[PDB]
């Protein structure tokens, strides 16, 4: 299930973390809020982790820290792959 | 390059390392035609031919090298996720 997580989900997680809402994160990434919501929901299912609390940001969603290092490598991977 | 998934990369590495779609499928507990289609999807995403008939291209061998580096980080992230 954690196998299923794609780059797009992590990019949307990082934007919500940063901008504080699904609405702001959609604004930042040029996506629509439906997309961010659906993606985060799928990410929470894949990880089996609740990432955001209307009470909103999990204890466990400090996973944004570790996602930052992986996002570096994902973008570096893309560049090597495009230059083949 | 696209925002493509981890499963696809794990599948690519197993074909590189076992030399066949079915051995890769066997190793990962996946269906062989699922492995083949995932690899085909990656070839379209990268606009690269990765295998011939399955023998890697020169581009695939270099891609294996870049992918092993990203795989180090994907593993750390998943361990951190499974730990929460």
From Swiss-Prot, chain A:
The lineage of its organism: Bacteria, Pseudomonadati, Pseudomonadota, Gammaproteobacteria, Moraxellales. Homodimer and homotetramer. Binding of chlorhexidine at the inducer-binding domain causes a quaternary structural change that favors interactions between dimers to form tetramers. Residues 3-57 form the HTH lysR-type domain. It is found in: Cytoplasm. Binds DNA via its N-terminal domain and the inducer molecule via the C-terminal domain. Disruption phenotype: Deletion mutant shows a decrease in chlorhexidine resistance. This is HTH-type transcriptional regulator AceR. Residues 22-41 bind DNA. Regulates the expression of the AceI transporter. Binds DNA and chlorhexidine. Binds to regulatory sites within the intergenic region between the aceI and aceR genes, and affects the interaction between RNA polymerase (RNAP) and promoter DNA both in the presence and in the absence of chlorhexidine. In the absence of chlorhexidine, prevents transcription of the aceI gene by disrupting interactions between the promoter DNA and RNAP. In the presence of chlorhexidine, activates expression of aceI. Belongs to the LysR transcriptional regulatory family.
């Amino acid at each position: 299930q954690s196998m299923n997580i794609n780059q797009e989900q992590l990019l949307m997680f990082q934007a919500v973390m940063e901008t504080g809402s699904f609405s702001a994160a959609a604004r930042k990434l040029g996506k629509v809020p439906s997309a961010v919501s659906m993606s985060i929901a799928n990410l929470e299912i894949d990880l089996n982790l609740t990432l955001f609390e209307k009470g909103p940001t999990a204890e466990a969603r400090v996973l944004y820290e570790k996602t930052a290092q992986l996002l570096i490598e994902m973008n570096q991977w893309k560049q090597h792959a495009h230059a083949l």
